[PDB]
């Protein structure tokens, strides 16, 4: 399973991050060893977001 929803709006100016809106669904494509960031896919493309800003959806 790799479906999640954003807990909060997240928007960074940092290159290679993805902006997400609270309530938006996303899928996780890649993780990191420490689990703090993950590469997400939404209708707006792909990029990295903080893992603590998302939560799974069955
Ligand atoms: Na995090």
Contact 18, 30 (CB under 8 A): no
Name residue, tokens 């792909």: 46
Domain boundaries, the chain: 1-58
Q: Which technique was the structure solved with, according to the deposited record?
A: X-ray
SS3 1: coil
Closest CA to 27 of 11, 5, 9, 52: 5
Ligand 1 geometric centre to CA of 38 (Å): 8
Between the two ends of the chain, the Cα-to-Cα distance in Å is: 8
Q: Which residues surround the ion ligand 1 when the cut-off is CB under 5 Å?
A: 36, 50-52
SS3 51: helix
Ligand 1 geometric centre to CA of 34 (Å): 9
Ligand 1 geometric centre to CA of 36 (Å): 4
């Amino acid at each position: 399973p790799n479906l999640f929803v954003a807990l909060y709006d997240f928007e960074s100016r940092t290159e290679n991050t993805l902006s997400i809106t609270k309530g938006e669904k996303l899928r996780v494509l890649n993780n990191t060893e420490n689990g703090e960031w993950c590469e997400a896919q939404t209708k707006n493309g792909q990029g990295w977001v903080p893992s603590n800003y998302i939560t799974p959806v069955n």
